[PDB]
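Reproducibility note. Readers wishing to regenerate the assembly model reported in the main text can use the exact inputs given here. Chain order matters: entities are listed in the order in which they were concatenated for prediction.
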Amino acid sequence: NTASIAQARKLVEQLKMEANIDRIKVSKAAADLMAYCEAHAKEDPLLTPVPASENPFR
Amino acid sequence: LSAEDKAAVERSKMIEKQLQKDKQVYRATHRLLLLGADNSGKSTIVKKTSGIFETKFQVDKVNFHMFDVGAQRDERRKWIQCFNDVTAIIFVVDSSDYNRLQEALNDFKSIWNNRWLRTISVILFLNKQDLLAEKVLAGKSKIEDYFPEFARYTTPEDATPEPGEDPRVTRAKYFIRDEFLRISTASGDGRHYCYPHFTCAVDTENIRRVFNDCRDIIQRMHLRQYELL
Amino acid sequence: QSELDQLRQEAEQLKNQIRDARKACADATLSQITNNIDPVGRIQMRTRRTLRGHLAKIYAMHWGTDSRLLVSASQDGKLIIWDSYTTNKVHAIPLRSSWVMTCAYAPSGNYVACGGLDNICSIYNLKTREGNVRVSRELAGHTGYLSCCRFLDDNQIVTSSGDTTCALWDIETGQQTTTFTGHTGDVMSLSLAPDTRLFVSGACDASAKLWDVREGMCRQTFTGHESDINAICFFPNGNAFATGSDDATCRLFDLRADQELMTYSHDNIICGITSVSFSKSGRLLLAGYDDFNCNVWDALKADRAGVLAGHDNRVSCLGVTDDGMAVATGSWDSFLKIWN
Amino acid sequence: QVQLQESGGGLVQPGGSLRLSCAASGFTFSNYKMNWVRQAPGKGLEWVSDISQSGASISYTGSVKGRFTISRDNAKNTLYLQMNSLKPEDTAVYYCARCPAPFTRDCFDVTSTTYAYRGQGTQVTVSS
Amino acid sequence: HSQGTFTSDLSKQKESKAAQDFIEWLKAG
Amino acid sequence: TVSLWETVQKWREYRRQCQRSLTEDPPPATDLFCNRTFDEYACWPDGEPGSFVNVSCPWYLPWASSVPQGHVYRFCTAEGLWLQKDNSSLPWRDLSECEEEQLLFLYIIYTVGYALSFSALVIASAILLGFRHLHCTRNYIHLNLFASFILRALSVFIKDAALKWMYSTAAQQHQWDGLLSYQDSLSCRLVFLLMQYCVAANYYWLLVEGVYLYTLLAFSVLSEQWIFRLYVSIGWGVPLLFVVPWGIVKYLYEDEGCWTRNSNMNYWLIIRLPILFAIGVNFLIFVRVICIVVSKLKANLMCKTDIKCRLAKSTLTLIPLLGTHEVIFAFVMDEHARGTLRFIKLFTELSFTSFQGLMVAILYCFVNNEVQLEFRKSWERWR
Ligand SMILES: *C(=O)CC[C@H](NC(=O)CCCCCCCCCCCCCCC)C(=O)O
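Running the prediction on these inputs yields the following structure tokens for the assembly.
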């Protein structure tokens, strides 16, 4: 055996095992992303720079 | 002026003091990458089951660290970037095969033109000169069907090693040398160079040959900073 | 020989089925859905601290969990631990092989790992009784250079290598417990999930993958880039990851949508990304470059906002802290810089 | 995902002619170098011909020098290797290749294990 | 060293001229 | 080289002696000639009644010290009073028949050079220090070289600014015809010692520059932290070893003037010979560096007999850094008290040395590629 067919078999079963999985809509994914940002934007320092008082890297 | 932070600042000065005498060792050694063909790689005359191999040799009280890459996968466009600060790249070519010589020409060309290696000079060892001598003199295998240009190449003004060199063997010997030199001079900007050498399988005067070309490389680098050259 | 042709046809048709299923599952582009949303606005960043002491170029760096200390490995043969508040140096570990390509900081702060061209990984015990550091373990066993480490926790580390594999180790045992195969080119970097439950790995074949440390098996395989993937990281929610490749620039993928959402390009940008990390809120994607810069891409918009110019040679690593206060960028000029 | 489809192989008498057309998709085209690598049976695979981005830096392996011709159609996203005088020593799988990077003038693409941006292969056989 | 000699020569010129100014003024009371 | 002071003192004694002689013999012999009245120029105590009375030339005057002993026939009046010529108190004009713009031109020329050079060196040092990418041992030696040039410029300006202080001011001269001046202050003496030190420290920051360049091409590198300390000590400390002994010698055995005039050439050998040694060594280094450069240009194997253009450029860009223009006349010492030769020696040395700072500043801070890339980058990062 050249084992090329053996490798192709595991490759195609890898592909098949990846096909039968759940899908969602990219619009819903983008909506969820937008949400994460908006919800933690207040806390993100590089978006809203912290006052020097707290800034440990004064 | 704190009190507990004194210990930390004292600690950061012991480290600085230790890093300071490692700077003067790291700058007192030359790092050479030993590349080339799969064969002809001879880091034994210059004198834990994987990774990278390192051999240290000392010439004229100058320390050289030469790294023979081993146990790595075939593709090397990605780990080659680690060696952008080496002083020179040693490239060893197996002449006297005529078959994979073109596959060694292309390999050297890629080294020359890489974006992270444009400033690193290569030292070229046209290895296995003994086999080349026997191959042409025998005449069974003829170097015309791998490079058609050998039907018109004429030997240049050069130095045959010993009185007794057949004109043929000293012609093919220099022909291969010129093939690498065409590639080297194509990137005309003189920011790095190629030093050719006809090495043999075993040569005592081979560690020094590396020494002199690194000495030339460093001097040429200093003269550039002073715009003297 | 006919069976090989049959298998090739099967693979081609299954790939067609996969691409068609991914098609028509996308209604609107992230650009269109993110059209009313306002721009971040040009952000100005300045170097607050420049850490000096490394001799040769820097290949990797990693922030500590306290967002206070960080380790950085340089190819002079040393990796040293800083205190980014006071620029003081806490430790300076000399390595055995000078060719180190990656490093990581253990979450507990007790350990630091490193590895490089030499196919190995070394764990360093920081909090030691004698007070002098020492290598606690060498995780030998796989071929090919090692290009990223990321401690799962104390006594469990995952490694990516140039042998086109990834592995999960047991520090005290010293033996591979799981191995992840399927990549065809060198694996350049991997990022653990925020929940430390999966991870992603981009490789030198312009393709990424998702694994699971429980049982070694690839879950998804995202394509789209055209050349070697150089860096990758997780989005804070753990439901995405942005990978920047040599092809042109960077991209964002979503695991559940199983398709690239949107790219990050520009005509002037002509080299390739070298390192990527998100900001705390997943609103600022940062990215190194061969042009010595570090652009600051807003995640939701295809237009960059800021630039972190200041490095003399190329930028090789950058990472945002856990509190988001600071951003560090090592580079081939052998300096670290802490922007805020 | 990147693709490289090649076609044209077949049985030809010595001194005959063939045309090898390389169909590419899934990656920028003009920005890259392109190469021809063939694998003669019983030995490793070897580089043959190259052509730069614009299509102005042709270069050949000495063996096929003055015999084969290459051409790039950027608009068609195709590459060609015209074959003029065949020998029975060129009998080999052909492999349209691509450089790993764009806007760059070097390529480490001969590798014998898993280079990714490489064609699947066509067999050209010259005999009687 | 140039500036050393130049100055020495210059000083001698200024010194000699000053003595003249003393021989031309003493004459004029 | 008669001092004003010496002349002044000499005159004072002559006057005192004359006063004594007049008091001794004031009475006229015949009581029909000029009375014994001692003028400031001369005594003329004797008088010829209606005749000419030879009054010998004074016993103390630099002007006529070498002049012969001709007298001054005082044509006095037989009436016993002094005669009058053209309504003047005294005729007898036989009274004392007894007896350069090149320096100005050289002054203007080198003052201009030191000015244009000091300005450019201040700019160059600011540029070379500010960028922080250019910090390296090479540019540190350059920074000390620039500082030495700047000290030379300020030293020269100051040096000739005090030279006229105790000379040109008529105040000084009036105060020298009586009491003391600025010539006796120690402050003045030290202005000129400072000048000697600052010049000597300039030839030794050229020697250091050349030795550092030579040790990169020839010897293996050593600790860049210790070599720099040795170089700083050589550049700034070695000059003391022979400019302080010169000051001691001047204070002891030759203190006239404010140490401006090299009356004893031997004492001036002590702060010269070292300078000749430094420039000779630097010339040797220049020759060997140029032969290394031509060796590289030959062995390049790409030479197309145009190497003379590149080698000329290299020689001309290396001349100011090592100060090799100074050697063409360095061996024509001040035992060659010529005329045209002296002028030329001074002209070339002063002119080229003055602008040497300008040439060094340009060649090593304004057209340097590294510093040109510091700007291009700083300009790109400006937005
Ligand atoms: C002794 O007799 C007194 C000397 C006095 N003066 C002179 O001899 C004339 C000297 C020449 C004039 C000064 C030249 C100044 C050059 C200014 C350069 C400035 C350039 C600045 C650009 C940045 C005398 O009357 O004899």
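We highlight two features of this model. The two ends of chain C are 61 Å apart (CA to CA). Residues F 104, 107-108, 111-112, 115-116, 119, 164, 168 surround N-hexadecanoyl-L-glutamic acid (CB under 6 Å).
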